[PDB]
Enzyme design. Structure first.
Site, PDB file in Angstrom:
ATOM      1  CD  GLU A   1      -3.101  -0.673   2.195  1.00 29.74           C
ATOM      2  OE1 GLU A   1      -2.860   0.164   3.101  1.00 29.74           O
ATOM      3  OE2 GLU A   1      -4.222  -1.190   2.018  1.00 29.74           O
TER       4      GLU A   1
ATOM      5  CD  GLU B   1      -3.973  -5.701   2.962  1.00 34.75           C
ATOM      6  OE1 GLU B   1      -4.660  -4.990   3.716  1.00 34.75           O
ATOM      7  OE2 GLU B   1      -2.751  -5.500   2.784  1.00 34.75           O
TER       8      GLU B   1
HETATM    9  O1  LIG Z   1      -6.033  -4.331   9.189  1.00 31.58           O
HETATM   10  C1  LIG Z   1      -5.706  -3.119   8.554  1.00 31.58           C
HETATM   11  C2  LIG Z   1      -4.873  -3.378   7.305  1.00 31.58           C
HETATM   12  O2  LIG Z   1      -4.673  -2.162   6.634  1.00 31.58           O
HETATM   13  C3  LIG Z   1      -4.146  -2.402   5.350  1.00 31.58           C
HETATM   14  O3  LIG Z   1      -4.160  -1.191   4.637  1.00 31.58           O
HETATM   15  C4  LIG Z   1      -2.714  -2.890   5.520  1.00 31.58           C
HETATM   16  O4  LIG Z   1      -2.129  -3.129   4.261  1.00 31.58           O
HETATM   17  C5  LIG Z   1      -2.746  -4.180   6.329  1.00 31.58           C
HETATM   18  O5  LIG Z   1      -1.430  -4.595   6.605  1.00 31.58           O
HETATM   19  C6  LIG Z   1      -3.490  -3.923   7.632  1.00 31.58           C
HETATM   20  O6  LIG Z   1      -2.791  -2.979   8.402  1.00 31.58           O
END
Ligand SMILES: OC[C@H]1O[C@@H](O)[C@H](O)[C@@H](O)[C@H]1O
Ligand SMILES: OC[C@H]1O[C@@H](O)[C@H](O)[C@@H](O)[C@H]1O
Lengths: 589, 594
Positions: B155, B237
């Site tokens: 990110e 994610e």
């Molecule tokens: O659970 C929140 C998530 O936020 C995302 O943006 C990040 O890439 C993950 O590593 C985690 O921090």
């Protein structure tokens, strides 16, 4: 030895009471050194005291200046000629409501612990002393000058307890040939006296305070007795007025009460009036106070409510002390003080103006890098700094944030003002709606409003000015920056032939002829914020928040015939004419 | 090549939909890797995804660890033996609600611009890659392993636009033999996608989001179209739950709604559930959120409201997703899930106790210097740091101030507690009436409560823990400090034979015997704050502010026979016995949802 410290001060074998006034040579123009020193003499006082400002004498590492406005040797010679003795406080750190407490800003680029026994720091102070001390040693009284004694550090008890540091400074002075007595000054209570002194090593101790001499001296006496010292009592700084800060009310001190408090000191010992004549913080050299994490910048005028006003004229307070002296200390001869007359003009009209953005390239040559840089790492000590980058907008509305910027930021996009943020406002969300096509110019003008000169924030991260982390757009830090350092030490480069635009930082020129130079005050009560020059000489800062709404112009800054005043104003509030007044303009608060 | 990214994912020449779930090998005890991976497979998913935590594998510069809890190669082997493919995200920065976003704390002692194209930082990432990547390369699908692809950075569009940085990370990975496809993941909107990607250099792009797949995927599609890319759509994610922070209420997400949201993702493309199984931030490895200048530390439990709970048992959410898969994606074979059983043990009595001050010398060798030092410059990454000086009182009452200390400070004078200050309280005036005569001992216990793992405060000055400026008494900074770094990685050095005093940080030991080791929860609802150990293993932090009031104890942390829990408690609040429960104890906070 002509001057000795024993059970008392002795000058040429005889008991001596020191009657000293503070006058900082760097705060009074050289043409008025005689005037101000004369008026101290005329008071019946016998000694002048001054700090020495490291940041003025070594503005860049290895580049030394001791001429003109900085001719300390000449300031001392005029003192001797008027039959005045001198106390010099040459500490690397002078506090003094002065930029960074006197420390050169380039020190912030060094790997060192400033104001400590860190040898990197000591070495720097040494090289500085290698240049300064040889100029003072011949002026020691023993050597035929007028210097009685000199200070080691300055209120060190209100900063640390590093004895090696105090010993190092004393040592540097000694091996440079300083053989007069040396001393420290501190708050007159146990904590500060213990931490700030080398009393167990026979280093003379003085106290600083602005009232209740009896109580304060007794604390000092108790400290002396504890260490078996039979020493005279001296107040090295008797605060007789006080300094002013922006947005804060001017508070004066009753001339008669001050007169009486001074009497109380003289009855028991010696005094140095802080300030005798305070003068002015020309250019960007003002200091800054701290309250917790908050900075509170100090004003351009160092009038201080001193005996002589900023301009150098005696005041009720001066006269009240003259009478206290003539009444209680008649053995000290007095004289009639000198006065300067001030001049007054109305409506000197605007001749010419120009936006910063238009004259930017003749003033400054930009430094480009991928990531944003801070003021001092760019090589700049004082003034303004413009950060410039280009970016396209990725949404109808986008959020901008300045991360870790100081002290004050004004943000423009394609020349259009968006936002201004001061101190703790820096970092707050800025929302902008930009052009759908192409790169847009993001300009952020940063001002260094004065580095803190004292205490726990002395070496805070905020002391390095500019943007320390970056500027976020949406969620990402922007890259590709052009930096324009704007110390504005080169006012002759301002090109008034270029364009002007409402709502921007700009230069405004006002011309006038003068027949005989006289003191006067620039009325800036209808200008927003910025600095002013007269014949290319930076007068210092103005800000309509008050309390001060004027800049003092010494007669010696003017020239017979044609004169040019230039005002850099950052808020967009200006006037097509300027008034020069007899008396300063004040804002009631 | 067996796996290719074209207008779609192709595996062995055939259209392939990735059904992935995040399981962090470092957040689950290795004895339970099989369990978690099996349950992912039982769901009908075909892939596991994990970050790699640089700060675990290189705890001290030049010292590398890939065995035991850190045996990523074994985690990948277990996944493969279970017929699972893998996605690895070996970014130097992983965010992940993890201490310092996964960056080693020792980087803070270096002259470098962390997380940029600064060659000093790149050189550090490369040396780490020199140890990590040779381990994963044999495990790429093309080489007989199960790794399909790997992420570049993480990110980064939520942090910068330094394209040279991204290219450098790509170059290092290639130089080490990583020949599988590479990719970025970012928020699915224009600013983050432009800033975070190398799309113009054909580096695959994925998106992270927690809902509205149709809308978020259309944003990604527009970006792809703009660049002439015909690529499959993948959510790298899909946030299926969320993390918790101390003092903040637990808010859960409806199982059915979440199942529905996942269905929307699979209807158009591929997914990686974040988290499938969240597990635990053992020891001091929790991360920290920021709001403006304020830090908001995250809790020990990374339950996350995930499909498997912290323990690893299926939840209502797991079952909701399984029903959704059974109905809408029945071509994916499922299995019966595994459940572990928990245990409870009542009133295990306190056996021994010792105050920190009394056992200091066996725990920590002092570092002495004139001026106070920060935690990292002393060589310490995590835990507590005791500052000790001696001073005499120059007035009946004197003022003390701690200047630029983080994160939490406890001040004692001659063993007596004076004040505790947390975060912004640090620097407030402390008034004290000192001994009539001689030197007093000034003790300041500092805790590092977790470095921010994301955003504008990622490199704030507050990331360096301990006291950065000094301790003022009256108006002067105090000199002559003895520093006792207390990482507490050496609980066997605790000397319970020494003395104990009320109102001080201390250790407390509770012994018990176990016939059949089962999962259980240490109830710490009546202990103030600190950490707890079981058989020398740091379970992580507890704090009676909640919402969590227990520490999960995995079965594999227990022994057949005699077991010993050690509790380090800092607030002076403890009880003469502990209970182990079958379910966690929670504190009801206003706003909560279940
Ligand atoms: O659970 C929140 C998530 O936020 C995302 O943006 C990040 O890439 C993950 O590593 C985690 O921090
Ligand atoms: O005017 C306030 C004064 O405070 C004193 O303590 C200091 O030594 C002086 O330099 C000046 O700052």
């Amino acid at each position: 030895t002509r001057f000795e410290i024993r059970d008392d001060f002795y000058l040429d074998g005889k008991s001596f009471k020191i009657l000293s006034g503070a006058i900082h040579y760097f705060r009074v123009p050289p043409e008025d050194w005689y005037h101000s020193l004369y008026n101290l003499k005329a008071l019946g006082f016998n000694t002048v005291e001054t700090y020495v400002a490291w940041n003025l004498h070594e503005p860049c590492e290895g580049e030394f200046h001791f001429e003109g406005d900085l001719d300390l040797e000449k300031f001392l010679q005029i003192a001797q000629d008027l039959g005045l003795y001198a106390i010099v406080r040459p500490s690397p750190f002078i506090c003094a409501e002065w930029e960074f407490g006197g420390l050169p800003a380039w020190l912030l680029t060094k790997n060192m612990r400033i104001r400590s026994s860190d040898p990197a720091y000591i070495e720097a102070v040494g090289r500085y002393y290698d240049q300064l001390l040889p100029r003072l040693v011949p002026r020691l009284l023993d050597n035929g000058g007028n210097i009685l004694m000199m200070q080691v550090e300055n209120e060190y008890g209100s900063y640390g307890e590093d004895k090696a540091y105090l010993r190092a400074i004393r040592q540097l002075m000694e091996e440079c040939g300083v053989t007069c007595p040396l001393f420290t000054s501190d708050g007159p209570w146990r904590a500060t006296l213990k931490a700030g002194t080398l009393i167990e090593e026979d280093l003379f101790v003085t106290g600083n305070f602005g009232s209740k001499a009896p109580y304060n001296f007794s604390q000092m006496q108790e400290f002396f007795d504890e260490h078996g010292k039979k020493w005279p009592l001296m107040c090295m700084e008797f605060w007789d007025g006080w300094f002013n800060r922006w947005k804060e009310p001017i508070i004066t001190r009753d001339p008669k009460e001050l007169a009486d408090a001074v009497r109380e000191v003289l009855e028991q010992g010696s005094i140095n009036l802080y300030m005798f004549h305070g003068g002015t913080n020309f250019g960007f050299m003002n200091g800054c106070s701290a309250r917790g994490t908050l900075d509170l910048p100090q004003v351009t005028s160092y009038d201080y409510d001193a005996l002589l006003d900023e301009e150098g004229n005696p005041t009720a307070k001066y006269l009240a002390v003259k009478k206290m002296m003539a009444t209680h200390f008649s053995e000290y001869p007095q004289l009639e003080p000198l006065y300067k007359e001030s001049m007054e003009l109305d409506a000197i009209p605007l001749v010419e103006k120009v936006s910063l953005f238009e004259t930017l390239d003749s003033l400054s040559s930009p430094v480009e890098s991928l990531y944003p840089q801070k003021m001092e790492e760019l090589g700049q000590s004082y003034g303004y700094l413009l950060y410039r980058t280009e970016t396209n907008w990725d949404a109808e509305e986008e959020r901008l944030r300045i991360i870790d910027g100081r002290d004050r930021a004004q943000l423009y996009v394609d020349g259009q003002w968006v936002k201004t943020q001061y101190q703790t406002e820096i970092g707050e969300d800025i929302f902008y709606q930009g052009k759908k096509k192409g790169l847009s110019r993001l300009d952020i003008l940063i001002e260094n409003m004065g580095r803190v000169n004292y205490g726990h924030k002395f070496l805070a991260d905020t002391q390095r000015k500019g943007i320390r982390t970056g500027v976020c757009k949406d969620l990402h830090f922007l890259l590709n920056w052009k930096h324009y350092p704007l110390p504005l030490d080169n006012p002759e480069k301002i090109d008034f032939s270029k364009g002007w635009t409402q709502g921007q930082p700009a230069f405004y020129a006002y011309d006038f002829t003068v027949e005989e130079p006289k003191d006067t005050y620039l009325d800036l009560s209808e200008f927003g914020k910025g600095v002013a020059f007269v014949n290319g000489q930076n007068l210092g800062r103005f800000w309509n928040v008050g309390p001060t709404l004027s800049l003092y112009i010494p007669h010696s800054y003017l020239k017979e015939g044609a004169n040019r005043i230039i005002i850099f104003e950052t808020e967009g509030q200006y006037k097509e004419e300027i008034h020069l007044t007899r008396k300063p303009t004040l804002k009631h608060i």
